[PDB]
RNA sequence: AUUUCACUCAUAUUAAAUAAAAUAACUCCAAGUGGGCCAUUUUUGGUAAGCAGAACUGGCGAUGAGGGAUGCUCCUAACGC
RNA sequence: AUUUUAAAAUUAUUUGAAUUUUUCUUCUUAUAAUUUAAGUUGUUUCUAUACAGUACUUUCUUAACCCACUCGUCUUGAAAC
């Protein structure tokens, strides 16, 4: 009938006005903690103390060398770790187990902390979506938000910027976002490496260790 | 369906609308909060430093002390280890 | 400004403890300051130093500050005092140094390069004691008394560096290197 | 003459290429040799309970048609 | 010529410790054990008999059978591509009641009752155990008198 | 080398020619797989005789068509040409080698009334 | 390069069309093809797969059995993609609704006379579009001599199989591996 | 021990994390092979050896492309047009 | 021959509220059009007022620049003295 339409344009509709008023809240909370965060250190300075700063719980992980020549235990965590040729990037929650998991391989990767920008603009350019039925999924760029609606919603998430709020903040739904999402692939950087061999922290031009914030110039530069 | 083009989310006016439904407003804002400042020049850069007058004064006592006891204590170590060599 | 007469050394103060325990609820607190690229770097040398000399690895620590010390007047000129420790292929020695310059890293950028050209001594093998600004009438070396006399003079005695536009490859006649 | 008598490089390459496998985790194992006189008692004790399962299920058949 | 014989290479597995030689001790024969419990292999050598073999020494594995002074275990090994099951037959000496199993039991035990309150008050609560994770951040009170310089140290 | 005219393009027009076809004469030049150890072109060996494979194949669109941008279908007598006329804007005709003046020149003139083209309408005059 | 198995490619294990050319089993395969698609029923997508298989894995069912299958299920239809056969071991037959392959001349004839209807599948396909009322059924699919051979290695302990022997007797394989007295037993 | 009957144990976030985990499990019929060698690390005999004998991984054999002037095994990296 | 629709954006009239107080301020709370949506369209000239010409298509021949050891076989290893 004619009526099959006009109720769906409404749900669309209101839909989309939700979606609307939660990205307002989330700038809101944006701001909001960021300004209490650089008034709590000019507080500390005052009243003799220290402020340690909470740690991070995301890292984005790159990987640096081909798939020759590895030990089997190296590849077991590639396979784990969704990272299956060179240049491609993932994010990773933070535990005492992911660590383990990342100290087998650090001298193959460079990861860091990502800022908030950062994490729109890899979602924006470089966002590919898996659909279809399960193990069978046709790698597909964004450019619409009914797919994360038909998938996803259920848990309330209903366009882009959720997906990025549950990103840059670890919020409860955050394997399901980011199993989600195919692994990114990017082209090399602009001005090149220094050394892949050395390690980051060696007094020598190196790239394998962590760089904490130091992943966002990288990433700008291989987006 | 058959695929098409792929646009650019993020320089394509129409389709970054259509993927987040509040980026015209926040836009916006940021538009005419540009606007109004460079309107305000020889009259804006003035209340800055009647401003900074008003608190980089009360902050200032508080960074010198801080920094000034680092490096006084920097030098007790020196000095302490000095004259533990004789 | 110029990004082609830039060193990439700073200067950092780091403040430490270990997490407190049902033995040990309040633990010591340590600082340093190191000169290194970036703070990664800085607190990496700090864990370094920590589990050497005290008995703190990183893994049982927390980190409680990074705050990248600045400098004051960076276009006054001062005299500096290195004290130092370096491995040579048969052995390990240390040393005391000299040098002139407007800011602390710009010293110790110095300090590097003599170190690699007179001893072949890498950045690995070297440790950095106490680098502190002395006194004119407490100086050691020749070659830091001889730039402190009353009227400092002399003639410009270096080729010309010219631009790569008018680095003409074919000259017309034979240029000079008097100058005068 | 002389040959190679012992190595076992690339073995456990082939051991792995079809995985390690498992046993198969089954409900019921055979109970032929283990310990008798427990056994027996228990054949009789499910015959007693088959006998009394038996006896209503004829019942009841016996009822329903009337 | 090669020598396999059946207690090769046992001179230190198979030894009593230092100042602990002897015979077990009387509440050994108390130990209650039942079909389809966990089970640890240790070998005693003070008992030569119902000895286990050398490989089957500090292994866990299911009972499945129980005799007069016996006990039948059923122990994994792998065998070059595969896991064969064996079934390997000690004498009561040689055998250990698991703890492996502990900590699943208290679990067990301790979230009944949580699960019970929580039903009874009509609450939504987690069981599921929690992997360590990253801190909050906190204000750390010190004095300057009691921060510490230190720098590398010379060499002597 | 890629050659374009319209829409048809091709994507090589060298023949493949057998290895070693040049300095033997009886070796044919028509290609054939090289098998056998330490050959240097089975190994793709820089500096020798390319391999065909399936990567050169042609666009499914423009697979059959002759620069007339129509198929090619051959025709022994009048008959056989009578299913052209609800087709005639996507064939040609070429009339078989072995067929005598006479009969080629009633096909010629049928198919210009039916208007179809016929490609070797030059022959035996 | 990249790291996957059997390269980014989905294996599966089975037979695809039909290897027969019987016109009339072509007819029936594209018809069950069309009702298990526009009909997704779980009923037509199994039937249609069932007779695809070869002829090993469509085995006859007797009509004992399938009147012992049908005994709890009075006025329905019992559904046989294999030949159902007669029994001489059967005293009496009840009446019976069953749509099946092929049935033999004797079978036949019994099943009309108690009053039943014999059924082929293109009128199963207009009666019953999605197989209400009716149940599947499938014969012995382990009980062909061949499958005797299979398994452990007859000498391995404690097997089952047949072996493959000119005859039988007394002096055709019975003497050294099949007891004690000839040094072991299998 | 078993057999019945009654009551009750998180689940939509899945009784810890992560997973192009069902590209899984099983049965049948068969091919070729059963002279190997090399590198970092551990290691036996020998004054030693581009010698003889073992261990765990990765390679060469079965393999081309860029670099090391040159080179079966080193570094980067594995191959439709 | 009926998902190049819907929606979104734009422009000009509107029906109402905010606030950031405005010639890009917001909220499709009413009609029309347009594309920035919904993978390239237009205008001039030449070939040319030709029928095979020295132009265009194609096949041979001969230069340049870079590169390229003799196939088959046994062998851990072949361009092999
Ligand atoms: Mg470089
Ligand atoms: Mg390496
Ligand atoms: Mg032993
Ligand atoms: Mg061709
Ligand atoms: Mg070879
Ligand atoms: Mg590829
Ligand atoms: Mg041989
Ligand atoms: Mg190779
Ligand atoms: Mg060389
Ligand atoms: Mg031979
Ligand atoms: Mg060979
Ligand atoms: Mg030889
Ligand atoms: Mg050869
Ligand atoms: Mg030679």
Known sequence: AAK?????????????????????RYEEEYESERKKIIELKREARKNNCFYREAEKKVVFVIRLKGVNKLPPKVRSVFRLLRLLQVHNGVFVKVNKATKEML??????????????????????????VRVGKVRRYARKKIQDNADISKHLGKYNVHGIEDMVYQLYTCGPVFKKVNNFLWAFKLKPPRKGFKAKRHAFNEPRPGDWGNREAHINELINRMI | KK??????????????????????????????????????????????????????????????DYYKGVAKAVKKKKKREEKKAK | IDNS???????????????????????????????????????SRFWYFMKKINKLKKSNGELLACEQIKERFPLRVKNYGVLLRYDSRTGTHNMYKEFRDTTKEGAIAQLYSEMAGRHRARASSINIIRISEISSSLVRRPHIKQLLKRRLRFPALHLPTLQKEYRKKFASKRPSTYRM | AKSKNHTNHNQNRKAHKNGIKKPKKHKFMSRKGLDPNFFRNQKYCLKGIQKKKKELKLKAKQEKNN | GKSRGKRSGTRYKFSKKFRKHGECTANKYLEKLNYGDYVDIVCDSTQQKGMPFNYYHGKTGKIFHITKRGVGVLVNKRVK??????????????????????????????????????????????????????????????????IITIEPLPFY | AVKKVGKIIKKRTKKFTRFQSNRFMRVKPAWRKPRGIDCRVRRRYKGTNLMPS???????????????????????????????????????????????????????????????????????? | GIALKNVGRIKKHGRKHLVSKNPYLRLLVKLYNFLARRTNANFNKIIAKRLIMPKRYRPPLSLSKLQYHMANHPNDIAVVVGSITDDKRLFSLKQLKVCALRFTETARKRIEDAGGECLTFDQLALKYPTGKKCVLLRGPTKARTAEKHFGKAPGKPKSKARPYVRSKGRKFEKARGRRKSRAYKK
């Open chain 1, 4 to 24: 099959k339409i006009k109720t769906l344009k409404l749900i669309n509709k209101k839909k989309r006005n939700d979606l609307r008023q939660r990205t307002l």
């Open chain 1, 103 to 128: 100290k087998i391989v650090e001298p193959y990767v460079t990861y860091g902390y990502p800022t908030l920008s950062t994490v729109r603009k890899l979602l924006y350019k470089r966002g590919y």
């Open chain 2, 3 to 64: 695929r098409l083009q792929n646009k650019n989310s993020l320089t394509n006016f129409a389709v970054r609308c259509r993927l987040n439904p509040a980026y015209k407003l926040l836009r916006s804002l940021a538009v005419l909060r540009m606007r109004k400042s460079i309107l305000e020049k020889s009259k804006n850069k003035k209340e800055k430093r009647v401003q900074k007058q008003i608190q980089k004064k009360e902050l200032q006592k508080i960074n010198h």
């Open chain 3, 5 to 43: 007469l830039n060193t990439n050394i700073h200067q950092y103060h780091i403040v430490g403890r270990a997490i407190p325990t049902a033995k040990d609820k309040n633990p010591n607190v340590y600082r340093m300051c190191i000169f290194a690229k970036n703070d990664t770097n800085a607190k």
């Open chain 5, 81 to 146: 591509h595969r896991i064969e099951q064996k079934k390997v037959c000690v004498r009561i000496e040689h055998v250990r009641k698991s703890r492996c199993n502990e900590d699943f039991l208290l679990r067990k035990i301790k979230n009944a009752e949580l699960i019970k309150e929580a039903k009874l008050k009509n609450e939504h609560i987690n069981i599921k155990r929690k992997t360590e994770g990253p801190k909050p951040a906190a204000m750390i009170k010190v004095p300057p008198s009691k």
């Open chain 6, 54 to 125: 399936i990567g050169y194949g042609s666009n499914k669109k423009t697979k059959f068509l002759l620069p007339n941008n129509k198929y090619k279908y051959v025709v022994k007598n009048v008959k056989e040409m009578e299913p052209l006329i609800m087709n005639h804007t996507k064939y040609c005709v070429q009339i078989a080698h072995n067929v005598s003046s006479k009969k080629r020149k009633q096909i010629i003139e049928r198919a210009k009334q039916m208007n179809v083209s016929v490609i070797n309408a030059k022959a035996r005059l």
